[PDB]
């Protein structure tokens, strides 16, 4: 893991020592090489786990998240290097440093073998995205969004720290494999119920669970494009990864303690899909779609079925890719028309045909068109939920119907229809942003071609 | 002469430069010597 961590660390001196006319080129190229290096974690020819060191290890669950982070860093640089052209050189290098630090800390968080180090890197990732949102956001409400994000996460994560220290005192090491082997069954008392809630509520906050999801739409709206990408594509999945890692020592009382959160997830995905149906802001629509998909992931992890875990992993990877792609397309329209209003730009299919093709493919990925990994994850989550209870199919079907409805509504109101001819400032297309859309869509196609990479721990 | 007033850092403070370089060299040399003596003392105490 050190062979990925060290050159990502060396990206920062490269950023601060490169010429201002060469910084973007050098950092983008070497981050692409970093991702190519990170692809060596897929060499898993055995049932064992690649425990590289005493503090770093690789997993069938951790590996796709690490590869996705390393792949998202150059895409974030390409996405963010347009709204920083009228910007100071040291501020540009600081922004690149923030993105690189996010990538480093997220790779270390996913490769961590010890839960206290996982929590330390959790908060370490909490810092620079707050800095990015607050400093390079556009509207006034970025400060309130950053406060909401930071303190939802902190109030979640403090009882997680208390619970981790308690489990460390009880067991001795807080090492993941040691806990997985010497797991003890809890006796289902009120203290154990509170311990369960303490170690689950941080991840449920960052997922986000319904009712506590209020930080996410304003944070994603007010964030810059790279911040929205890293948030919606890695940090929610970081919460899910924490849930999967910590759920192994919570038997058996997760069986009955999972009940309120499954109901919250299902009804919240219905409610947030309805909000997407009636939402006037494109980034808000994408954010609430992310809330619904992560609610599906929450329900799968709560029901703790091998099909549910596999569908959760596939939906994590697929939703990260398609949500970053949707945010990049919305940011292209935002850099064109300087607005986020859903209905303001309408006939963009006429002027931007290839970008309309990218929009259509992103939305078809969003509504889980087969045989994509989006549909793979959603279908296996549905199968596991129907095994858990046959009446969940009603909520699943309503969610699927509204999902297709808001995705096609987005397509029709942003691309189809008559062209808003007053928008004289419609530059044709940037090869940079078309490349960004291609670099989002192609890994979706390749993972659709070979879905065995992102199945996860259970299969 | 560019500046209208002579800067306090127009010329390098040679006493400070010599003292700092000598302190750095002395500390490195003393560090290496005490590390070698610590290695030798550890070997002599543990019979290695």
């Amino acid at each position: 893991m050190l062979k990925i961590i060290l050159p990502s660390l060396m990206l920062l001196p490269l950023t601060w020592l490169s010429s201002p006319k060469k910084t973007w080129t050098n950092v983008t190229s070497y981050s692409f090489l970093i991702s190519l290096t990170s692809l060596t974690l897929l060499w898993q020819t055995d049932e064992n786990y690649k425990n590289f060191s005493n503090m770093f290890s690789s997993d069938p669950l951790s590996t796709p998240l690490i590869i996705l982070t390393a792949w998202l860093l150059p895409l974030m640089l390409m996405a963010s290097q347009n709204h920083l052209k009228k910007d100071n050189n040291v501020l540009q290098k600081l922004y690149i440093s923030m993105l690189i630090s996010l990538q480093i800390l997220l790779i270390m968080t996913f490769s961590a073998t010890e839960l206290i180090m996982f929590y330390i890197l959790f908060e370490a990732t909490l810092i620079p995205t707050l800095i990015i949102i607050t400093r390079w956001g556009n509207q006034t409400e970025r400060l309130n969004a950053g406060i909401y994000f930071l303190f939802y996460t902190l109030i979640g994560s403090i009882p997680l720290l208390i619970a981790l220290i308690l489990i460390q005192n009880h067991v001795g090491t807080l090492n993941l494999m040691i806990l997985s082997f010497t797991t003890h069954t809890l006796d289902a008392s009120w203290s154990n119920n509170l311990l369960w809630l303490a170690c689950m509520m941080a991840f449920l906050i960052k997922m986000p669970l319904y009712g506590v999801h209020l930080w996410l739409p304003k944070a994603h709206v007010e964030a810059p494009i790279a911040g929205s990408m890293i948030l919606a594509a890695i940090l929610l999945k970081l919460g899910s990864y924490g849930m999967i890692r910590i759920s192994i020592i919570l038997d058996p009382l997760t069986k009955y303690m999972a009940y309120p959160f499954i109901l919250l997830s299902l009804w919240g995905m219905i409610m947030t899909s309805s909000i997407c149906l009636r939402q006037t802001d494109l980034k808000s629509l994408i954010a609430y779609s992310s809330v619904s998909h992560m609610a599906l992931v929450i329900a799968s992890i709560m029901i703790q079925t091998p099909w549910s875990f596999m569908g959760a992993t596939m939906l994590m990877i697929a939703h990260g890719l398609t949500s970053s792609l949707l945010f990049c397309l919305a940011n292209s329209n935002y850099e064109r028309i300087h607005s986020r209003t859903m209905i303001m730009a309408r006939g963009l299919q006429m002027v931007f045909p290839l970008m309309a093709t990218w929009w259509l493919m992103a939305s078809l990925a969003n509504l889980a068109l087969p045989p994509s990994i989006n549909l793979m994850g959603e279908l296996f989550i549905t199968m596991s939920l129907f095994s858990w209870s046959n009446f969940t199919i009603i909520l699943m079907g309503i969610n699927i119907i509204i999902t297709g409805m808001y995705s096609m509504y987005m397509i029709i109101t942003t691309q189809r229809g008559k062209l808003t001819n007053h928008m004289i400032n419609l530059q044709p297309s940037h090869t940079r942003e078309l490349t960004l859309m291609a670099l989002h869509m192609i890994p979706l196609i390749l993972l659709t071609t070979s879905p065995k990479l992102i199945t996860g721990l259970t299969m | 002469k560019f500046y209208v007033r002579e800067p306090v850092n127009a010329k390098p403070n040679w006493l400070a430069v010599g003292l700092s370089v000598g302190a750095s060299v002395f500390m490195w040399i003393y560090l290496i010597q005490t590390h070698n003596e610590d290695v030798l003392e550890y070997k002599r105490r543990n019979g290695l």
Binding site: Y49, K50, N51, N54, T173, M177, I178, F181 | -
Partner: protein, 63 residues
Amino acid sequence: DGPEKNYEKTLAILQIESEKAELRLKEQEVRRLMRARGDGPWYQFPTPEKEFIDHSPKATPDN
């Protein structure tokens, strides 16, 4: 290098972590026992110094 390298590295890591866990639990028990009944090196609370007591003969013989 092959699967045996990763297998035996995992065995070494697990041995190290299990020994560390057992040592931490033993350290907690040692600290608790010493704090309860201080008889080891740790938690030795102070005591007035014995060497500052007069033992010379004094004015009053009843000392």
